[model samples]
Target: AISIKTPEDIEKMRVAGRLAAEVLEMIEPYVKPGVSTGELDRICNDYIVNEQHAVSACLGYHGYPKSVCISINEVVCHGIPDDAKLLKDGDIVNIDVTVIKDGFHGDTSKMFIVGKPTIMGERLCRITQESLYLALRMVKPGINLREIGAAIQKFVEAEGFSVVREYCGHGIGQGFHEEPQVLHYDSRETNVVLKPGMTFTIEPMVNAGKKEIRTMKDGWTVKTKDRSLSAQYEHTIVVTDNGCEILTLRKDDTIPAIISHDEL
Candidate 1:
């Protein structure tokens, strides 16, 4: 069954969400050439534990063993931080961060470019984030959940990109994963409806090539089967009477209030 968060629950989630966003903001500057993903992980771990007094949800999650998941280039998701992996110019990476505060969870992720970014990388990242926001604009009470996926699918495909079907978004709150699995691709047949209290993630993983993906030997990381570049954006949100609340938005976010759907 899907859980309905009370007003008090949403309040606590705000704290968790803000802290998780801050972790991403805090690590942006360190993402330069020659920096190790492991170092970034340690910085996030220390900040979440010492500064925020919160717990890293990704750490020890199903034996994940990392404070954050740093996916680079062809890596789709759940890229474990490794000291051997060094950032280089023109590399694109996704940093996924989840924090637990006051027993509630906040989940969010963003793509980052190390040093100079490629035009292809910039386009992939921009469109992936746009798809996520487009899906968010479809959120409201009584709306079918599949509409979110449909909008994302239509927008991504029109841009010559593919959405990964193997992994989709999920209901998140006190539990890391919950009901109402949110798919990034269209499936108008779904019957789930969005209620005012329902909260979930709408993370769209857009691939520059085929949507097919494979898991790494470590049994954690996922990567594109075609070895093509992939980008993703995630936000934890709650359905409101009129729209939705973006709980993980940071003060410095300049992603624009909205964008013309066809402009990109």
Candidate 2:
């Protein structure tokens, strides 16, 4: 099920990944209390389809109607944007975006705070983001996939947070959700070896409470069972002979986007 990208294929994926990052950048200014998720969804949809002239990977994928996924507060991920559900102050929002350019796909997500930030809510988002960055720095050739999850799980739990085991990061290429499903917690399932040209996402959904989750009737909206807050960060990367490079790095990002094997 795993597909190793060719040299030319990696370049195409870069364009796709860059476009995905651009969508997240465009939607940031619009996220706040009083704005309906529906409106924000529309803004991102137009930017992707009209402005960027690209296709949205999440739209119409397995009957998903929205162009972007917006999860808020207790909701973990895959929240369908709604016209009636306006964000409230101190809400933690996760906007997941994936775009298609030249038939290549790039997927990424980031958590945002509404008008104000709660102390734990802000910390949850920051810790979850740090967990993702810690895992990203572990990417390189000859690395075990399990190591990624092990590192993330340990670090997140040390912070008194829990990792969601249900959802995982996965291989993305010309097709979304390809293969080699990556879990946030270590498991025997992630025993494969990472190699050059292999591209995948590292999105770990973290809960401020216990890791238990509940899914809404819509078969998409996931929430923390204890009603505690959750946060997440995601990025797509390609394994290189020397190291790995983040295809979805944005303008505000502080990382170099490219890492050499020895730099870590």
Candidate 3:
């Protein structure tokens, strides 16, 4: 079912979103080779609990067992982090964060390269981020969800990339993963008309190879079937009278670099 957020809920989400954004910013200076995803998880979990008095929606979420999802390389989503899993040069890791505070929730994600990455790897990351923003620019009342995916898929394919179909973006308000699933690639009938106060996410997972993917035996971690590099970006937003507010945007996001570069 569709859900619309109230003004109070919107304000709570703003706080939660800022906290979630802080988690990303707080960890940016810590990303480097030899840094474990588990370490990053600890940093994020602590900030939410101590600084913001917020709750991590992913910890024990449907048995998720982690505060954040660290999907690296071929992993598409729901990747549990371990201390042994360390970052290295040329690795692209996606971090998904969801925070609940004041009875509302905010969700966002971004892909970060450990260091200077391979040419193709950088291209994939940049293009995926652009695809998300390109779709975001089109969000408004009465627009169809298919238009979002179609625009994303067109751009991804135009860049000779593929979009994963297994996991798509979804609604986020008081709960995580709500209605109006936002598909990354085009579909004939994924349409759900937009409306003001309807908050959700628009994350597109673009891969360097085929679009096929598989879920691990853990019943969570989704990985690309072709073992190619994949990248994704997400933002939680509420449709406004004129447009939508990107509630989960970090105060310091470098997406302009991704979209401005032409190599991708």
Candidate 4:
């Protein structure tokens, strides 16, 4: 069953989203060279449990064994935080976080530059972030679910990049991941309709090489089978009467351009 968020539920989601955003913002500064992913994991766990008084949604989520996902470079998603895995210069890491508070869920992910970013790596990161906004622009009452992926696929492929076929975005609300799976590749038919009270995430994972990927021995961390770089950006949103509002949005001025209904 699809869960439609109520006005009060939306309000609670705001709090959850804010906490999730603050956790990521706090961790951004620590994402530097010489820092271990395990240490970063503890920082996030402490903030979510002690400071924020919330729970790490990824901990034990579907048998996941970490507080957060620390995917570095080729590791696509769900990378475990190992103390032995220290960050290095020119590494691009994606810290995927989702927090549960007051019975609601807020999820978002962003790429962090370890030191000097590779030019192509930086461009891929920026473009992936922009793709989220472009995908969001295609959201409205009458737009097909497939249209969202079509828009994203077109832009990323045109830029000489490929989309990760596995591990697409999904509906996020009361539960960490609910219904209405949102894929980056175009789908011919889907039952989901763009209507008010619907909430989901538009997270597209773009690869710098071949589109193929594989999971690590841990059975969670996914990496590019061809050993190419990868970038991901995620945002949770709710469909409004006229359009949709980004629930896990940040005040970062660097975000290229946000879309309003008039622009669509």
Q: Number of clashes in every candidate structure?
A: 0, 0, 0, 0
Residue-level lDDT tens digits of model 4 in 1-264: 778889999989888888888888889888899999999999999999999999988998889999999999998888899999999999999999999999899999899888998998899898888887788877776677888888899999989999998777888877887888898988786556778888888789999898999987778889998999999988888887767777777767254223457644
Across 1-264, the per-residue lDDT of candidate 3 in tens digits comes to 888888988888788887887788888888889999899999889989998788999998888899999999999888888899999998999999999987778888898898978898888888888888888878777789888888888888989999888778898887787897888877897868988889898888888999989989989889889999888888888787767778878766643211121221
Question: Candidate 3: what lDDT?
Answer: 0.84
Ranking by TM-score: 2, 4, 1, 3
Residue 13 in candidate 2 has what lDDT? 97
Worst 10 residues of 1 by lDDT: 255-264
Candidate 1 structure quality by residue, lDDT tens digits, 192-257: 988888889988999999999999889999999999999999989888766788889875655532
For model 2, state the Cα shift of residue 180 in Å.
0.8
TM-score (all chains, Cα) for each model: 0.95, 0.98, 0.93, 0.95
Assess candidate 2 and give its TM-score to the true structure: 0.98
Candidate 4 Cα outliers beyond 4 Å, as residue runs: 253-259
* Poorest 10 consecutive residues by lDDT, candidate 4: 251-260
Candidate order, lDDT descending: 2, 1, 4, 3
**Predictions in order: lDDT:** 0.89, 0.93, 0.84, 0.86
Predicted candidate 2 versus true structure: per-residue lDDT over 63-123, tens digit per residue: 9989999999999999999899898999999999999999999999998899888999999
Better of 2 and 4 by lDDT: 2
Q: Given candidate 2, what's the lDDT at residue 91?
A: 94
Give Cα distance to truth, residue 128, candidate 4, Å.
0.9
